[PDB]
Ligand binder design. Sequence first.
Ligand SMILES: C=C1/C(=C\C=C2/CCC[C@@]3(C)[C@H]2CC[C@@H]3[C@]2(C)C[C@H](CC(C)(C)O)CO2)C[C@@H](O)C[C@@H]1O
Length: 254
Amino acid sequence: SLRPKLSEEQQRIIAILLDAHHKTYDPTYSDFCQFRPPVRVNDGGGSVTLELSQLSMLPHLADLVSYSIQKVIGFAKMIPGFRDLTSEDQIVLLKSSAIEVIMLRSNESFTMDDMSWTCGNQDYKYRVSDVTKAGHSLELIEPLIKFQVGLKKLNLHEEEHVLLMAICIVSPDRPGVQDAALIEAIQDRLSNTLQTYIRCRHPPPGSHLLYAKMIQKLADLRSLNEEHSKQYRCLSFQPECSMKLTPLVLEVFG
Ligand SMILES: C=C1/C(=C\C=C2/CCC[C@@]3(C)[C@H]2CC[C@@H]3[C@]2(C)C[C@H](CC(C)(C)O)CO2)C[C@@H](O)C[C@@H]1O
């Protein structure tokens, strides 16, 4: 019922997060041509044996994800309060949420026109088929696409988008966290900002239980995270796979 106005601090938090995102997410994807080139082998049959023997799209996608992890680290460092955490806790949070924030931020390039992550010409258009060419299976891809569509349909304001990523990163329920109380205090400040923003700036009927739906996406992400982890493990068993990855990727997912 009540719709309190955003406090000055809350307005500041949102401005800071919008700015952090604009500085770490290039909507033109102009750096992508610097990654190792994408290669698409003929795999109309979706052969696991062939996909693993080649891993043709892995070098490019690994570079894309490595690049993205670097951007997420930069984004996180700008989250109000993040710097108040110990170095040890900052790293724990980053490593555990990296893949989830990547899935979230990727929703910006995802398009329902053809269910792909379109980052430019045909060369930089990523489809389910490209993900399989990188060693992953439908067990991850299927729910990932469903997740992207579900997120797209929430029609989030950029303010809600950046707050969701911040809330995802600053989670007290990550294994290995030291000061969970502090992390939770920081997360609550962000969650309260999101709830307040939704209540006084998000017009209906898109505001109906929007917060609950957003929180459910965070739960969905935990599942996707676990499935990606299991599959990455399997992928890492392929001889010479490390050379197709990057040191940052090896560390975060290793
Ligand atoms: C990265 C970003 C973008 C798209 C995200 C995608 C499309 C390609 C496949 C990805 C990268 C998917 C998200 C997860 C999925 C995954 C399952 C991860 C996996 C990585 C590994 C092999 C190491 O296991 C390869 O496929 C583009 C832009 O919006 C920026 C955003 O930052």
